[PDB]
């Protein structure tokens, strides 16, 4: 699930709430993707 | 905050913002529902009366009909064509931070989307940005702006 | 069986628009929620932009059904839908053409074909209702 | 019915929209569409 969440944010750069519910991942997991994303400060 | 709508399609806000990266289409008209934060936007060649009328028609197909719309005191908005247009449509007009934040939210999403890939026109870029803000991004309880606008 | 599962997409011709006679039409097969744009052609560039506008207007579907037009089967469309995680595969969209052209005729003054089409789409989606009193927008998000 | 008639003159919506939105009879709303010259 997290594998598809990561590459989906790379396409749309949605917020952590969208990554958390759509792909069923932890809050700290979804928040980490946004920080780790270079296009999302 | 500003006086917002108690339920969707009651009170809208509309204002133009400038995206200089669009060149000739830098006049980005923005319309946002004050209740659901459902946002519609178009990039046009100007902010004249002809541009506002077409953006208003596009807003209605995208979001429905509101009871009231709040704009600033721009010449185009206070023109007679706009006043008499909203009169036929039975839409009231009144004379701002909600739509200003929408400007920030739109410009923020636009910047993020370049680094993913190249687009064809500002219309292409803007369509993608609007899709994310309205149909992807969600609140703490997991609802999109579209679901709040039609729920 | 529920909204945003299966869409249909095909271009139709409205000669009253002149240069913008290539009207791209996208319709949800469940809710009949309809989106349309008038473009200068039916090329791959036109389809890609119409697809982006469709997504902002209607959301993401699971599958989209088109005819065998060159643009739709092109590699740009195939690889675009691939990143979007959308699968790709006719009477429903043909009826939509009729419904769009019918509303366009009734509405005749507007500024551009974009103006006319926006009004037509507003009526079909947000005004016209079924026997139990629901619009296509309410069925698409209900 | 007065606001339903002139609303159809603007949008030319179907009779079902006129019936529920403005609260008029079916035969009233159907008559407006026939009476409308742009709706054959
Ligand atoms: Mg302004
Ligand atoms: Mg075809
Ligand atoms: Zn990002
Ligand atoms: Zn009529």
């Amino acid at each position: 699930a997290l594998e598809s969440a990561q590459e989906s944010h790379a396409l749309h750069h949605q917020n952590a709430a969208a990554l958390r519910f759509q792909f069923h991942i932890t809050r700290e997991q979804a928040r980490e993707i946004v920080k780790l994303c270079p296009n999302c400060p």
Side-chain angles (χ1 to χ4, degrees), chain A residues 1-27 29-41:
Chain A
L2 180 139
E3 62 280 328
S4 63
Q6 273 172 327
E7 61 170 332
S8 205
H9 180 92
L11 181 53
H12 308 274
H13 300 278
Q14 64 270 42
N15 54 12
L19 297 171
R20 165 157 135 265
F21 289 72
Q22 177 70 56
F23 301 103
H24 301 288
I25 58 170
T26 311
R27 303 182 190 261
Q29 282 184 316
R31 277 189 264 174
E32 187 175 357
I33 291 178
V34 178
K35 301 303 179 182
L36 190 65
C37 178
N39 311 344
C40 292

